[PDB]
Structure formats: structure tokens, C-alpha cells
Scaffold this motif. Structure first.
Motif, PDB file in Angstrom:
ATOM      1  N   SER A  32      23.036 -95.282 -30.597  1.00 30.76           N
ATOM      2  CA  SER A  32      22.769 -96.192 -29.494  1.00 30.76           C
ATOM      3  C   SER A  32      22.076 -97.474 -29.929  1.00 30.76           C
ATOM      4  N   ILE A  33      21.874 -97.689 -31.230  1.00 30.34           N
ATOM      5  CA  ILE A  33      21.157 -98.875 -31.686  1.00 30.34           C
ATOM      6  C   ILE A  33      21.951-100.134 -31.373  1.00 30.34           C
ATOM      7  N   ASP A  34      23.240-100.143 -31.717  1.00 35.58           N
ATOM      8  CA  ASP A  34      24.058-101.322 -31.458  1.00 35.58           C
ATOM      9  C   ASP A  34      24.275-101.526 -29.966  1.00 35.58           C
ATOM     10  N   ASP A  35      24.409-100.433 -29.214  1.00 36.63           N
ATOM     11  CA  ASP A  35      24.683-100.546 -27.788  1.00 36.63           C
ATOM     12  C   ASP A  35      23.508-101.116 -27.006  1.00 36.63           C
ATOM     13  N   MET A  37      20.669-103.020 -28.753  1.00 35.54           N
ATOM     14  CA  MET A  37      20.350-104.319 -29.333  1.00 35.54           C
ATOM     15  C   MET A  37      21.285-105.396 -28.803  1.00 35.54           C
ATOM     16  N   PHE A  38      22.500-105.016 -28.411  1.00 30.34           N
ATOM     17  CA  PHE A  38      23.415-105.984 -27.823  1.00 30.34           C
ATOM     18  C   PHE A  38      22.945-106.392 -26.431  1.00 30.34           C
TER      19      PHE A  38
ATOM     20  N   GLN B   4      33.238 -95.024 -37.772  1.00 26.59           N
ATOM     21  CA  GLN B   4      32.425 -96.209 -37.542  1.00 26.59           C
ATOM     22  C   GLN B   4      30.999 -95.907 -37.979  1.00 26.59           C
TER      23      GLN B   4
END
Lengths: 49, 82
Positions: A32-35, A37-38, B4
Motif C-alpha cells: 500500500s506504499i505506492d497507493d 504516497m500517490f 510488480q
């Protein structure tokens, strides 16, 4: 909270004599880091604009 | 496509540091260490790259030389005379 992005997150403004650390700190899953930080930076650019 | 960031591998006890691209020079020590680097890189491969192609030039310099010699006439006018 709708899609359970982070376990925790908060916004801080550490102030010093001539500097500071203005930003945020979040606690989330390993997928969930990218989800977030976006959306974290997306909220910052909303206030600026 | 079923692959990914997040499940690629298990990495433990590794710390990385990096700089902002605006806080560092794009071309740092270009000729100061890049030129001595390319000399190092070329030497590491010139003993495995040059000899195969040096031979081809030797074939070139001889295969073409013999071809013109064939087209050149040879003094074989004897046994006919006047």
C-alpha cells in the motif's frame, strides 16, 4: 479508511531556528506504499493549486 | 502482468542513500575519471574483441590482392613465338 490504505498516518510540522521538516508520516502494508504516497502527494498539490 | 514491486524478492538489512537530481551535477568528473575508465574498459576487452576482427582484415588484404592478380594476365606467351 474507505479501502483500508494505511494502518496509520499523520501530518507534522517540526520547527527549528531557521529550518524545519514539514510533511507527513504514514504506516501501511507492504502493498500500500505506492497507493497512498500517490494520494498523500495528491492532497498536497490540491492545497497548492 | 502478475509481477510488480512488492513480491519480487526478500531483501533484508540493506540501507540505500540517494540524492535529489537537482542537488547533484549531471556530468560530475566526466573526463576526470570517465576517460581513465574507458581505457580500463577497452583493455579488459581488446584481447577478446580485436584478434577476431584483426584476422578478417588479413583475409580482406589477401583475398582482394589475389583477386586482382587473377585478373592480371600472366606471361604465358611461349610455345607460339613468331
Amino acid at each position: 479508511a474507505t479501502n483500508k490504505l494505511c494502518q496509520s498516518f499523520q501530518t507534522f510540522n517540526i520547527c527549528y531556528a531557521d529550518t524545519g521538516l514539514l510533511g507527513a508520516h504514514f504506516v501501511c502494508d507492504h502493498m500500500s506504499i505506492d497507493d497512498m504516497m500517490f494520494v498523500l502527494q495528491g492532497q498536497w498539490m490540491r492545497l497548492c493549486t | 502482468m502478475g509481477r510488480q514491486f512488492g513480491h519480487l524478492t526478500r531483501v533484508r538489512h540493506v540501507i540505500t542513500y540517494s540524492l535529489s537530481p537537482f542537488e547533484q551535477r549531471a556530468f560530475p568528473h566526466y573526463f576526470s575519471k570517465g576517460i581513465p575508465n574507458v581505457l580500463r574498459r577497452t583493455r579488459a576487452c581488446i584481447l577478446r574483441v580485436a584478434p577476431p576482427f584483426v584476422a578478417f582484415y588479413l583475409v580482406y588484404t589477401w583475398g582482394t590482392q589475389e583477386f586482382e592478380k587473377s585478373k592480371r594476365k600472366n606471361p604465358a606467351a611461349y610455345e607460339n613465338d613468331r
